[PDB]
Design an enzyme around this catalytic site. Structure first.
Site, PDB file in Angstrom:
ATOM      1  N   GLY A  48      -3.819   3.963   2.327  1.00 48.80           N
ATOM      2  CA  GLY A  48      -4.105   5.357   1.994  1.00 48.80           C
ATOM      3  C   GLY A  48      -3.944   6.312   3.175  1.00 48.80           C
ATOM      4  O   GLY A  48      -3.142   6.077   4.076  1.00 48.80           O
ATOM      5  N   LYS A  84      -5.053  13.284  -7.936  1.00 44.51           N
ATOM      6  CA  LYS A  84      -3.776  12.867  -7.357  1.00 44.51           C
ATOM      7  C   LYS A  84      -3.189  11.776  -8.229  1.00 44.51           C
ATOM      8  O   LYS A  84      -3.939  10.961  -8.750  1.00 44.51           O
ATOM      9  CB  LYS A  84      -4.086  12.323  -5.960  1.00 44.51           C
ATOM     10  CG  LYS A  84      -2.987  12.463  -4.917  1.00 44.51           C
ATOM     11  CD  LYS A  84      -3.550  12.020  -3.564  1.00 44.51           C
ATOM     12  CE  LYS A  84      -2.461  11.903  -2.497  1.00 44.51           C
ATOM     13  NZ  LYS A  84      -2.232  10.498  -2.100  1.00 44.51           N
ATOM     14  N   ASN A 129      -4.638   8.460  -7.095  1.00 49.12           N
ATOM     15  CA  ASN A 129      -6.080   8.373  -7.274  1.00 49.12           C
ATOM     16  C   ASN A 129      -6.447   7.938  -8.689  1.00 49.12           C
ATOM     17  O   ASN A 129      -7.498   7.343  -8.914  1.00 49.12           O
ATOM     18  CB  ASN A 129      -6.668   9.759  -7.023  1.00 49.12           C
ATOM     19  CG  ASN A 129      -6.857  10.018  -5.554  1.00 49.12           C
ATOM     20  OD1 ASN A 129      -7.941  10.393  -5.162  1.00 49.12           O
ATOM     21  ND2 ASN A 129      -5.882   9.742  -4.728  1.00 49.12           N
ATOM     22  N   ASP A 180      -9.765  16.265  -5.136  1.00 48.30           N
ATOM     23  CA  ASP A 180      -8.531  15.577  -4.746  1.00 48.30           C
ATOM     24  C   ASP A 180      -7.947  14.705  -5.864  1.00 48.30           C
ATOM     25  O   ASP A 180      -7.564  13.564  -5.634  1.00 48.30           O
ATOM     26  CB  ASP A 180      -8.773  14.802  -3.439  1.00 48.30           C
ATOM     27  CG  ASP A 180      -7.484  14.484  -2.661  1.00 48.30           C
ATOM     28  OD1 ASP A 180      -6.465  15.204  -2.802  1.00 48.30           O
ATOM     29  OD2 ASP A 180      -7.535  13.567  -1.816  1.00 48.30           O
TER      30      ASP A 180
END
Ligand SMILES: Nc1ncnc2c1ncn2[C@@H]1O[C@H](COP(=O)(O)OP(=O)(O)NP(=O)(O)O)[C@@H](O)[C@H]1O
EC number: 2.7.11.13
Lengths: 338, 94, 861
Positions: A16, A133, A136, A131
């Site tokens: 990540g 994504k 994600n 966040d």
């Protein structure tokens, strides 16, 4: 007690921003789980200890929802900071988009609705996820989404209050952040609109624009101006209902956006034509049927992850050579346990 | 100023050994400044020893940096990269 | 130097072209016959007639929404989201007629309106109060003010018990008589009020939330709208004063939840049925998100459906009080991305074409191309093709254009995401659209798609994308033989002949493999377009000779043609090739990737792309940030991208023979020069000359060969145009190469540094774009030397003198911030340039001292 010796490290399954994810097994109870590693030497700022401490608080508040991931064990050995978490059997949604490229509307509707339930749970409890994504978002073995990095979330938001910190991945930052406005959970609905376009089209709406190549194109100074100032256009092949969802989340004004009303917003998401097909109660339950079931090859589905990770060497990176004088050996305690 | 430091051509695979940052400096006359920040391992800057993570850079190749941005000074050093000279202020290192 | 440079170059901006960005306010004046547009950027543009434009821009760059003209007078009022109001005044500066700010107003906010003959202005605020202003001197009159308690004193029997009157709104002006104002309060209360006698002349009741008022020129009836999809219609007479219930009140779209109505206009007093025009009102449950204006007359209702949000609208009509007709000739509407006008003379109400203020953006602008000194035969052929492919009246026809007829026919032509090329009259003050070519017609579609609301779709602006890889990456045009090359995102390149006749033909298509001998990396990105097989009908205009295709469908980063030789070169992210269109065989192809790569062979989404960090006080958390410092290297970036493709007739093998040659240029700093063997049974052969490898590996941005007189090699077919073009051949040539950080020139039989200049060493800079240009002197224009102009990554333009490589001037053309503006540039060959200050607009600059432009207008004030 919990510590690095009990869990044996099979393969790296994700690299990540600030973390390494390993598939890890136990013998005392025979089960296998993901484990995410942060570097205690990396999180050395006052802001870094705050974001990694608050990341524990998001798992603390996210104690149970079907579309999130639960903290099963935690440990802080040898300049590393470990979170042990539900192993996702199906990879991230980004790898699924590499294999598929384009989702038909029946597939894309399902994922956006489940991601809407996950998003609403954070907002309603007092978390802005900050966040969202395409990587994600993750898949179970049955294909239900999980939403899964809690690092940058806003904790403790009262319903109708706001934040001012600049945060999130550049392709998905919402306009009100770049302006310097104070912002609510409207930003998470902006990031859902981007992600829905990326599923249905197969490309970012806020791509580096379709002009010919130049340097200072892969800079966020370019992308931030593209998202602020440029119009956005839907592929004319999309169904009219799908176009209307994308437009309505893509509105540059947070007050205009679908879902951003401080009381009735999610009821509009339930009532919009594209969503009108889907049963929100059955969608929190087991009872809705996902359209795609990810891989059953390998010992544990290791093939689902990127070649960059699923061929990486297994150690923690070998040592803190010279770094060992600099490192912390106690300060992150108290967010060591579940 | 204290000294101007020659940073050599590598003649080889080894990089020049730096990362640089924006910041501020003062005498009450507070002003922006550009700084050294990470002496990265195995890069040829580490062979010189007179550099430090503490230090402000005052000139690059005998041209004053004072008005430039950090994005302009990395331009002034991605080119101009075979025959560096950098001028630095503190003699006492305090 | 002794100031000899000042005859050659000096820096100017010219007024912009195309529709304004972020429109926000509008006005129209029937007595001057001029229109003005206000904008969220704080701009106040005026568009009175063909070739007439003016532009204000306030002291403070705040958003606006109110504009009014003093009808027949040199002045306008414009209202800001701020407390401020200020007066704009237009003056005939002796050549250069222009708008300038007169006076400023303040209060310790919401609407304003003005009166004719009884010359007065009235303002309304967010509190339930109205104020009056003599526009002659920007102040309120302290006695002429109207507080909520005064208008409340009249109270109807339901409201007698309550003081909670809602916001002031929808101040409407007088209606033939000189002293009556109509007032709305968002609560639903409506009044008509007298200035000269300081009293109510009538009340009108109302109960639901309000948002419109209107007057009819004969005050027998009036119309109002409510923020629930309803509208109240009322009649007026001296006995109607108690106004118990409305006269014709209705909601125009059924029993449903039906949104709001934000404006109404009434045109009923003409001969025929009751013209009513309104914005909003559509049923929210089935037609909610979309933007529309409904026009009603008698039984005919249509809704006009627009591709972007409605700002405001006006009808063409006469303000003469002695007139008895509402005279609605045409209706004009300002959308967020277009202005449309529609004429109501005939059923179905036709749209009216626009002479100016065109929506350039209607498909996104992917590239800028320019050609100068265009032949009259070609221009006549292009406009003949334009008019062949393409009551009728334009209402906005006020002031007059004083500028000269074009003495230099410049054409700017643009490629768009839709795979279309548009041609524009770049000569003089403003653009005009000439013609539109669609490349998209060649390629098959890989994917594919009255009622209760009476819908008709209107406006040229399109909010949809046809396909991501039809878009035009580069364009080039060969004036002297009417051939054009256009290059696309999926490795397609078309060469087209101009043929002003409709005909049916099948193209010849070729494909070229950049990595033919090199082992195959696996392309999982854009799948290639398939051209439709068999014969295709084509329009009179540009028609494709042949198609060429690249093995990896990467963006064609470079293309050029040298029509005498009959060659085209094309170049991608991965390699380049040459093709001869006369005999259809490829001449060469070459890969120029490093033997391993990162930013290649991939889909449109990927994990590896890392975005270079901002340095602003926006865009980061509160304060240091890191940047590294490092010498460039053979795999530091996408290093196989082809930036230059150039043709030259020059001494590369040996000084005796003037052989024809082609030059590639790459992100690696590799310059593959090639010699060519043009025949006149046989085809062109190519062999590598000297690969030149730069000392700093910085990408080459332009290559130009200087003929031994210090003059660049001519354009390709210029042997049809002049004697003066014929280059030197007796002195040995030099090649000039521009890298992103330094310029060099070299002597072609033995490459050695004749001259060099390093910009970035002396001051932190980089060069984005380069082109060579000539500067004819302002007088004694016989002195017409040549220079290269370079665009800095900081937006500055610098001019360098060839071959000497000395900086002549140092000018701040574009800002650091507008990277999309910097990336959009094209240079005309005479020291002038176009850049996109908005996706909607081009701005123009000139750095030649002889080629300049100014506003030049007059008006009967
Ligand atoms: N529970 C999991 N099971 C399987 N894969 C996972 C899991 N959690 C994370 N991953 C993978 O690991 C990658 C990076 O892990 P993540 O927790 O998102 O690290 P990160 O640094 O926070 N990433 P990022 O969001 O980009 O900043 C993800 O994109 C997934 O591909």
């Amino acid at each position: 007690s919990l510590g690095l010796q009990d869990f044996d490290l099979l393969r790296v399954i994700g690299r990540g921003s600030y973390a390494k994810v390993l598939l890890v097994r136990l013998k005392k109870t025979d089960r296998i789980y993901a484990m995410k590693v942060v570097k205690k030497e990396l999180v050395n700022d006052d802001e870094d200890i705050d974001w990694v401490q608050t990341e524990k608080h998001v798992f603390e508040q996210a104690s149970n929802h079907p579309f999130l991931v639960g903290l099963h064990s935690c440990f802080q050995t040898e300049s590393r900071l470990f979170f042990v978490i539900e192993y996702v059997n199906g990879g991230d949604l980004m790898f699924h988009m590499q294999r598929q490229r384009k989702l038909p509307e029946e597939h894309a509707r399902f994922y956006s609705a489940e991601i809407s339930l996950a998003l609403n749970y954070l907002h309603e409890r007092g978390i802005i996820y900050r966040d969202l994504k395409l990587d994600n978002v993750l898949l179970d073995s049955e294909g239900h989404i999980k939403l899964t990095d809690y690092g940058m979330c806003k904790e403790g938001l009262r319903p109708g209050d706001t934040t001012s910190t600049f945060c999130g991945t550049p392709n998905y930052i919402a306009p009100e952040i770049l302006r310097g406005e104070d912002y609510g959970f409207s930003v998470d609905w902006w990031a859902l609109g981007v992600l829905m376009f990326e599923m249905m089209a197969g490309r970012s709406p806020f791509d580096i624009v379709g002009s010919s190549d130049n340097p200072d194109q892969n800079t966020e100074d370019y992308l931030f101006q593209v998202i602020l100032e440029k119009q956005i256009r839907i592929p004319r092949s999309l169904s009219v209902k799908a176009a209307s969802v994308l437009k309505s989340f893509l509105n540059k004004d947070p007050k205009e956006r679908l879902g951003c009303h401080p009381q009735t917003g999610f009821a509009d998401i339930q009532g919009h034509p594209f969503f009108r097909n889907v049963d929100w109660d059955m969608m929190e339950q087991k009872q809705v049927v996902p359209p795609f079931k990810p891989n059953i090859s390998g010992e544990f589905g290791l093939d689902n992850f990127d070649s960059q990770f699923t061929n990486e060497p297994v150690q923690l990176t070998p040592d803190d050579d010279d770094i060992v004088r600099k490192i912390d050996q106690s300060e992150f305690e108290g967010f060591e346990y579940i | 100023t204290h000294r101007r430091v020659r940073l050599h051509k590598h003649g080889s695979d080894r990089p020049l050994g730096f990362y640089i940052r924006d910041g501020m400096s003062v005498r009450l006359e507070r002003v922006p400044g550009i700084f050294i920040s990470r002496l990265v391992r195995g890069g040829l800057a580490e062979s010189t020893g007179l550099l430090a993570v503490s230090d402000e850079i005052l000139e690059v190749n005998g041209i004053e940096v004072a008005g430039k941005t950090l994005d302009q000074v990395t331009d002034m050093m991605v080119a101009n990269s075979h025959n560096l000279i950098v001028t630095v202020k503190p003699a006492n290192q305090r | 130097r002794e100031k000899l440079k000042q005859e050659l170059f000096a820096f100017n901006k010219t007024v912009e072209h195309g529709f304004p960005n972020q429109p926000s306010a509008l006005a129209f004046d029937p007595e001057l016959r001029i229109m003005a547009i206000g904008t969220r950027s704080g701009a106040v543009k005026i568009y009175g007639a063909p070739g007439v434009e003016f532009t204000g821009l306030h002291r403070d760059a705040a958003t606006v929404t109110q504009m009014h003209f003093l009808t027949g007078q040199g002045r306008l009022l414009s209202l800001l989201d701020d407390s401020s109001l200020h007066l704009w005044e237009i003056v005939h500066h002796n050549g250069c007629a222009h708008l300038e700010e007169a006076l400023s107003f303040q209060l310790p906010v919401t609407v304003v309106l003005l009166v004719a003959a009884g010359d007065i202005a009235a303002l309304g605020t967010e509190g339930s109060s109205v104020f009056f202003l003599d526009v002659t001197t920007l102040t309120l009159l302290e006695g002429q003010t109207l507080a909520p308690g005064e208008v409340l004193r009249s109270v109807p029997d339901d409201y007698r018990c309550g003081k909670a009157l809602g916001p002031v709104e929808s101040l409407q002006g007088h209606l033939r008589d000189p002293t009556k104002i109509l007032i709305g309060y968002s609560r639903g209360l409506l009044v008509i009020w007298n200035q000269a006698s300081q009293c109510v002349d009538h009340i009108f009741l109302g109960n639901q939330q309000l948002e419109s008022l209107c007057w009819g020129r004969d005050s027998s009836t009036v119309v109002s709208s409510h923020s629930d999809g309803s509208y109240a219609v009322w009649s007026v007479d001296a006995g109607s004063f108690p106004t118990l219930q409305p006269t014709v009140a209705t909601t125009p779209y059924g029993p449903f939840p039906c949104k709001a109505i934000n404006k109404i206009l009434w045109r009923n007093c003409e001969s025929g049925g009751h013209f009513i025009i309104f914005s909003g009102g559509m049923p929210r449950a089935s037609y909610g998100d979309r933007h529309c204006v409904s026009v009603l007359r008698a039984e005919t209702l249509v809704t006009l459906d627009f591709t972007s949000r409605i700002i405001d609208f006006f009808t063409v009509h006469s303000t003469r009080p002695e007139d008895e007709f509402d005279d609605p000739q045409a209706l004009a509407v300002l959308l967020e991305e277009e202005l449309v006008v529609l004429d109501l003379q005939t059923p179905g109400w036709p749209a009216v074409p626009a002479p100016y203020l065109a929506p350039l953006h209607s498909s996104a602008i992917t590239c800028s191309a320019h050609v100068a000194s265009v032949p009259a035969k070609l221009w006549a052929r292009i406009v003949s093709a334009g008019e062949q492919q393409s009551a009728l009246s334009w209402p906005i026809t006020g002031g007059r254009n004083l500028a000269q007829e074009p003495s230099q026919r410049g054409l700017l032509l643009t490629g768009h995401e839709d795979g279309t090329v548009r041609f524009w009259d770049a000569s003089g003050v403003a653009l005009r659209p000439l013609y539109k070519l669609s490349t998209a017609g060649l390629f098959q579609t890989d994917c594919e798609h009255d009622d209760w609301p009476p819908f008709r779709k209107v406006g040229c602006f399109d909010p949809y994308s046809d396909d991501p890889r039809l878009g035009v990456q580069k364009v080039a045009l060969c004036k002297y033989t009417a051939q054009m090359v256009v290059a696309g995102t999926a490795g397609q390149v078309l060469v087209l002949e101009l043929s002003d006749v409709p005909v049916e033909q099948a193209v010849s298509v070729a494909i070229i493999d950049l990595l033919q001998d090199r082992e195959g990396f696996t392309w999982k990105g854009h799948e290639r377009l398939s051209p439709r097989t068999g014969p295709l009908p084509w329009p009179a205009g540009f028609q494709p000779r042949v198609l060429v295709q690249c093995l990896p469908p990467a963006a064609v980063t470079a293309v050029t043609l040298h029509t005498e030789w009959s060659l085209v070169a094309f170049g991608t992210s991965h390699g380049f090739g040459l093709f001869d269109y006369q005999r259809k065989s490829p001449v060469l192809a070459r890969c120029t990737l490093h033997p391993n790569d990162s930013l290649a062979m991939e889909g449109p989404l990927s994990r590896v792309k890392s975005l270079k960090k901002s340095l602003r006080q926006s865009f980061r958390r509160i304060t240091p940030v890191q940047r590294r410092i490092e010498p460039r290297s053979a795999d530091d970036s996408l290093s196989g991208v082809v930036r230059c493709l150039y043709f030259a007739d020059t001494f590369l093998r040996d000084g005796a023979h003037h052989g024809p040659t082609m030059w590639a240029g790459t992100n690696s700093g590799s310059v593959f020069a090639y010699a060519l063997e043009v025949p006149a049974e046989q085809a062109v052969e190519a062999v590598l000359g000297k690969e030149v490898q730069l000392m700093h590996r910085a990408p080459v941005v332009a290559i130009a060969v200087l003929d031994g007189r210090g003059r660049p090699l001519p354009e390709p077919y210029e042997a049809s145009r002049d004697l003066a073009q014929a280059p030197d051949m007796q002195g040995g040539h030099a090649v000039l190469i521009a890298s992103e950080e330094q310029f060099k020139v070299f002597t072609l039989p033995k490459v050695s540094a004749k001259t060099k200049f390093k910009l970035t060493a002396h001051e932190g800079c980089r060069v984005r774009k380069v082109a060579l240009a000539t500067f004819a002197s302002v007088a004694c224009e016989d002195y017409a030397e040549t220079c290269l102009a370079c665009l800095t990554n900081l937006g500055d333009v610098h001019v360098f003198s060839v071959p000497g490589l000395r900086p002549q001037v140092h000018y701040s053309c574009i800002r650091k911030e507008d990277i999309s503006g910097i990336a959009s540039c094209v240079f005309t060959r005479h020291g002038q340039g176009f850049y996109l200050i908005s996706p909607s607009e081009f701005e123009r600059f000139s750095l030649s001292a002889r080629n300049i432009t100014e506003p030049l207008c007059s008006l009967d004030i």
